[PDB]
Amino acid sequence: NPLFSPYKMGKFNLSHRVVLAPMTRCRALNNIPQAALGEYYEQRATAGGFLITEGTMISPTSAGFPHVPGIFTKEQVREWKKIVDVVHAKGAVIFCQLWHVGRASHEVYQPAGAAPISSTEKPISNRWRILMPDGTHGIYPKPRAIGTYEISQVVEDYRRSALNAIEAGFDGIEIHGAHGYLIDQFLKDGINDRTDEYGGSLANRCKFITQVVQAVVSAIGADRVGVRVSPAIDHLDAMDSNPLSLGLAVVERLNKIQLHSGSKLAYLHVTQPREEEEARLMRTLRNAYQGTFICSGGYTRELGIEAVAQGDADLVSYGRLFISNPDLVMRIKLNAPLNKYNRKTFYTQDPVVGYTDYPFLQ
């Protein structure tokens, strides 16, 4: 089984290719990492296994979901440290995903109920609705288009959070540049129609993610940095007229950064829509990238094996199946039956129900 072939992700020696995909679970009450998260990650940690955490706030204005962890305060750093130690004790490698939602927010998630920030004043349409703290759904508001000074500030937020992540003991961080969030709002031409140096051409649309990655790279080292994008996913009205070209353009930026840094990023992480055309899009991005490639989106044991075997990806990340199967790695290795997951408890707040109460093997 290819999934259990060792792999060197930079300085990190992984014993298998099954990765825990980053997943927002909303158990981090008041944006503070709780003990429950420790139990959760520890249940899924394996020796030499790679784990990516739920999206984590880089500032007070970066959230769009309830009770998601942050890492911009020393209090959050101290709490994260406890979780990282528990995970490291099992011999797992873990990265903290830095997440800023941009316009995918609500005044209820913003300080002083201010408006969410974005690349333009374009709001997500009524085709989508945001999950509110009380479990109902609300209207995505019109965002405030930021200037270049504020853009530099946001980049600084990523840099600080990355350092905080290292201070907490994380092996690295992953820049969440996909699924229609802040970075994707600058990338996609369906959204970004700015007239300044951050808009217009594809080159300009890629400026933000380039500066964000360079900033974190300069702060903690390329090998401790992973980057996630989803050029072919139009979630939250974030579509581009030429996904493959957008993807290849981001890839060129990453290769350029590595060469200029004289080091390689931990990896490029790409989420695909879920068929032959999509699979060709993925492989094309991978072939263009000088480094480790992590594929995600609707993968199964069989599809994961096929991916590594056909050389389509070095590592495979699982989300939903990892929610209901804490020992997903072991089950995949023994090819044991998987348990079903309950979507109703994907984003609830209980520290146990639908979070750490999914059973281990029979």
Ligand X SMILES: Cc1cc2nc3c(=O)[nH]c(=O)nc-3n(C[C@H](O)[C@H](O)[C@H](O)COP(=O)(O)O)c2cc1C
Instruction: Please give the residue ranges that form the binding site for ligand X (CB under 6 A).
Output: 21-24, 54-55, 97, 99, 176, 178, 228, 271, 296-299, 318-320, 346
The answer to whether 228 is a known ligand-binding residue is yes
DSSP conformation class of 145: E
The answer to whether 97 is a known ligand-binding residue is yes
The answer to whether 215 is a known ligand-binding residue is no
Nearer to ligand X, 62 or 296 (CB): 296
Nearer to ligand X, 77 or 270 (CB): 270
Nearer to ligand X, 289 or 347 (CB): 347
CB of 346 to ligand X, least distance (A): 4
Nearer to ligand X, 22 or 199 (CB): 22
Are 44 and 87 in contact by the 8 Å Cβ rule? The answer is no
The answer to whether 319 is a known ligand-binding residue is yes
Nearer to ligand X, 22 or 143 (CB): 22
- Cα dihedral value 74, 46, 228, 301, nearest 10: -150
CA distances from 72 to 58, 75, 248 (A): 6, 9, 32
The answer to whether 22 is a known ligand-binding residue is yes
CB of 325 to ligand X, least distance (A): 11
CA distances from 253 to 220, 234, 294 (A): 18, 22, 17
CB of 266 to ligand X, least distance (A): 15
Q: What is the residue type of 132?
A: M
Six token digits for residue 277: 């055309």
Residues after which a C–N gap over 2.5 Å breaks the chain: 274
The answer to whether 9 is a known ligand-binding residue is no
Are 301 and 278 in contact by the 8 Å Cβ rule? The answer is no
Q: Is 181 considered catalytic here? A: yes
Cα–Cα distance, 196 to 69 (Å, whole number): 33
In the set 109, 181, 198, 289, the catalytic residue is 181
CB of 196 to ligand X, least distance (A): 28
DSSP conformation class of 312: S
CB of 219 to ligand X, least distance (A): 21
* Number of alpha carbons in the 13 Å side-chain half-sphere of residue 324: 12
Cα–Cα distance, 15 to 5 (Å, whole number): 7
Detail the residues annotated as belonging to a binding site for FMN.
22-24, 55, 97, 228, 298, 319-320
Q: Which residues are annotated as a binding site for substrate?
A: 176-179, 274
**Which residues line the annotated binding site?**
22-24, 55, 97, 176-179, 228, 274, 298, 319-320
Kindly list the catalytic residues: 181
